[PDB]
Amino acid sequence: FHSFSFYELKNVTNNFDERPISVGGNKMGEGGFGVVYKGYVNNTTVAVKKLATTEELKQQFDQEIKVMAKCQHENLVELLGFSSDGDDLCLVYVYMPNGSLLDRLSCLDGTPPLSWHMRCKIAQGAANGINFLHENHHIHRDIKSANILLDEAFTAKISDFGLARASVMSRIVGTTAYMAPEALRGEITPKSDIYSFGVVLLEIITGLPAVDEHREPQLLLDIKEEIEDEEKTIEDYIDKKMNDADSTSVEAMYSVASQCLHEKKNKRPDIKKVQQLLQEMTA
Numbered sequence: 127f128h129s130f131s132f133y134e135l136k137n138v139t140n141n142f143d144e145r146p147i148s149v150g151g152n153k154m155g156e157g158g159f160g161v162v163y164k165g166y167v168n169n170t171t172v173a174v175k176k177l178a179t180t181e182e183l184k185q186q187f188d189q190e191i192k193v194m195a196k197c198q199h200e201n202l203v204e205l206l207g208f209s210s211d212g213d214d215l216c217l218v219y220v221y222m223p224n225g226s227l228l229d230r231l232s233c234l235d236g237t238p239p240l241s242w243h244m245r246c247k248i249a250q251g252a253a254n255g256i257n258f259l260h261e262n263h264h265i266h267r268d269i270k271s272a273n274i275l276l277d278e279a280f281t282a283k284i285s286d287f288g289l290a291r292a293s294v295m296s297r298i299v300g301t302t303a304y305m306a307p308e309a310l311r312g313e314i315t316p317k318s319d320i321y322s323f324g325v326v327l328l329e330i331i332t333g334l335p336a337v338d339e340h341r342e343p344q345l346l347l348d349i350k351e352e353i354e355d356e357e358k359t360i361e362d363y364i365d366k367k368m369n370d371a372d373s374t375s376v377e378a379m380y381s382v383a384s385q386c387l388h389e390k391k392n393k394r395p396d397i398k399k400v401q402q403l404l405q406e407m408t409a
């Protein structure tokens with residue numbers, strides 16, 4: 127990695143301006159380590175995470191580094207460096223031009239809807255990123271659409287490794303709308319990551335967020351039960367902001383989603399099967 131001065135990062139982010147990009151400032155959004163800022167260093171656009179308890183935050187800071195030191199891959203975000211010298215710890219990444227899957231699915235800041243063809247490639251890439259992490263004996267613990275970033279060619283890039291673990295069952299963490307039953311109870315298994323990817327795939331098919339309090343069902347994973355009981359079909363939930371979806375491949379992706387969302391962890395497919403199933407979709 128390169129090493130950055132805190133005051134260099136403070137300088138190139140307009141003294142950490144927290145108002146959004148469109149109004150004038152540098153806040154791109156908010157994640158696991160709070161606010162992420164846009165900046166420019168070494169003739170290169172960069173995302174800066176400012177890691178603002180303080181003791182528990184440093185453990186997550188080192189985890190992001192220890193994971194991103196060894197684990198370099200096509201479908202994982204890239205850490206360019208870090209800063210420890212100033213008041214708070216910081217992490218610098220290569221800026222992903224198209225932001226998060228979540229924001230593009232909701233068309234935040236007026237971006238055009240993602241096509242079905244685009245959505246499939248993203249599904250595949252995300253699975254490939256998750257596959258690399260499981261091959262290298264890592265569990266993410268926070269797979270969700272906010273943590274899948276999209277590059278200049280809409281390549282899926284998995285991010286946020288603060289809550290990741292290397293390789294069990296008293297500190298339960300993650301985002302409850304995406305977490306499996308056993309993870310909510312406190313189990314640390316790579317099978318929990320497959321469940322969450324199940325929900326992420328339902329977001330891709332439907333363009334609906336995992337949770338919405340102004341909606342029935344409030345949790346997106348409950349549509350699986352609506353479809354199995356034949357009250358509604360998957361075709362009734364397909365995102366209407368696409369002009370290029372077809373039934374077969376959508377049903378194919380929903381089948382992968384449905385198998386991922388099995389409540390019994392040992393009956394879910396492993397990531398290599400999910401990856402194989404999603405390749406058979408496009409082929």
Ligand SMILES: NC(=O)[C@@H]1[C@H](Nc2nc(Nc3cccc(C(=O)N4CCCC4)c3)nc3ccsc23)[C@H]2C=C[C@@H]1C2
Binds near residue numbers: 225
């Ligand atoms: N899991 C996350 O940390 C998410 C995201 N983090 C990042 N975002 C971006 N890119 C980004 C973000 C927002 C806007 C735009 C943008 O310019 N456009 C123009 C066309 C449409 C979008 C680009 N790059 C990186 C690189 C390393 S982390 C990261 C942020 C949003 C939600 C959180 C914080």
